[PDB]
Enzyme design. Structure first.
Site, PDB file in Angstrom:
ATOM      1  N   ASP A 299      16.645 133.162 -29.129  1.00 47.87           N
ATOM      2  CA  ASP A 299      17.498 133.888 -28.179  1.00 47.87           C
ATOM      3  C   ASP A 299      18.330 134.991 -28.832  1.00 47.87           C
ATOM      4  OD1 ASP A 299      19.775 132.877 -29.399  1.00 47.87           O
ATOM      5  OD2 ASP A 299      20.451 131.637 -27.717  1.00 47.87           O
TER       6      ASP A 299
ATOM      7  N   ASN B  54      22.935 121.660 -25.659  1.00 47.79           N
ATOM      8  CA  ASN B  54      24.149 121.724 -24.842  1.00 47.79           C
ATOM      9  C   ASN B  54      23.847 121.961 -23.358  1.00 47.79           C
ATOM     10  OD1 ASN B  54      26.775 122.163 -23.908  1.00 47.79           O
ATOM     11  ND2 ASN B  54      27.342 123.562 -25.562  1.00 47.79           N
TER      12      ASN B  54
ATOM     13  N   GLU C 276      23.592 116.932 -37.043  1.00 45.07           N
ATOM     14  CA  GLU C 276      23.893 116.935 -35.604  1.00 45.07           C
ATOM     15  C   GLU C 276      23.893 115.524 -35.009  1.00 45.07           C
ATOM     16  OE1 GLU C 276      24.955 119.354 -33.750  1.00 45.07           O
ATOM     17  OE2 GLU C 276      24.304 121.228 -34.630  1.00 45.07           O
TER      18      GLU C 276
ATOM     19  N   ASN D 259      31.930 117.905 -25.102  1.00 43.98           N
ATOM     20  CA  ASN D 259      32.632 119.087 -25.594  1.00 43.98           C
ATOM     21  C   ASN D 259      33.848 119.357 -24.722  1.00 43.98           C
ATOM     22  OD1 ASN D 259      30.509 119.655 -27.552  1.00 43.98           O
ATOM     23  ND2 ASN D 259      29.309 120.439 -25.838  1.00 43.98           N
TER      24      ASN D 259
ATOM     25  N   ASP E  43      35.004 121.723 -23.093  1.00 38.43           N
ATOM     26  CA  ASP E  43      34.893 122.468 -21.841  1.00 38.43           C
ATOM     27  C   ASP E  43      34.240 121.667 -20.719  1.00 38.43           C
ATOM     28  OD1 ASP E  43      32.081 122.548 -22.341  1.00 38.43           O
ATOM     29  OD2 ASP E  43      32.199 124.565 -23.146  1.00 38.43           O
TER      30      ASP E  43
ATOM     31  N   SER F 299      31.086 120.383 -20.980  1.00 38.44           N
ATOM     32  CA  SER F 299      29.662 120.269 -21.256  1.00 38.44           C
ATOM     33  C   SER F 299      29.386 119.119 -22.242  1.00 38.44           C
ATOM     34  CB  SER F 299      29.126 121.602 -21.760  1.00 38.44           C
ATOM     35  OG  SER F 299      29.524 121.849 -23.094  1.00 38.44           O
TER      36      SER F 299
ATOM     37  N   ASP G  36      26.473 117.573 -25.378  1.00 38.91           N
ATOM     38  CA  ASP G  36      25.348 117.788 -26.300  1.00 38.91           C
ATOM     39  C   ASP G  36      24.452 116.542 -26.394  1.00 38.91           C
ATOM     40  OD1 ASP G  36      26.588 120.325 -26.887  1.00 38.91           O
ATOM     41  OD2 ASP G  36      27.390 119.573 -28.781  1.00 38.91           O
TER      42      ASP G  36
END
Ligand SMILES: [Cl-]
Ligand SMILES: [Cl-]
EC number: 3.2.1.17
Length: 129
Positions: A101, A59, A35, A46, A48, A50, A52
């Site tokens: 989650d 994110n 990562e 990213n 969209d 957003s 990281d």
């Protein structure tokens, strides 16, 4: 800060990630390797809108607030900047929420494509832990 391999393993082990929700320590070091290449200051945008952040590339769409992701949530209740610190506590505590989650470590695409189903133990081999 750019961690060494055994150095990060140890810190992740100080903060409780070894076997957290069943994922051994090698999985978490492997995930950080691909990562962020062990750099707490890593950032990546990213498509969209957003972003990281940090050694586990958490994110802004869902987990932290950077003031520039319309319609996002902040479920870890932190500014994304806190995910860039040489102290990894904020990243570790938010990772614990993410991996619990429902989808486990499959939340990290890179873990799914590069660590899952490999000899992850090799990422902690040799380290004094
Ligand atoms: Cl392991
Ligand atoms: Cl990937």
């Amino acid at each position: 800060k750019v961690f060494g391999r055994c150095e990060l393993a140890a810190a992740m082990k100080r903060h409780g990630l070894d076997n957290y929700r069943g994922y051994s320590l090698g999985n978490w070091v492997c995930a950080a390797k691909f990562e962020s290449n062990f750099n707490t200051q890593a950032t990546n945008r990213n498509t969209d809108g957003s972003t990281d952040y940090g050694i586990l590339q958490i994110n802004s769409r869902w987990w932290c607030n950077d003031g520039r992701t319309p319609g996002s949530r902040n479920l870890c209740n932190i500014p994304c900047s806190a995910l860039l610190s040489s102290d990894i506590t904020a990243s570790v505590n938010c990772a614990k929420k993410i991996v619990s989650d429902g989808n486990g470590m499959n939340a990290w695409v890179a873990w799914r494509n590069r660590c899952k189903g490999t000899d992850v133990q090799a990422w902690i081999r040799g380290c004094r832990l």
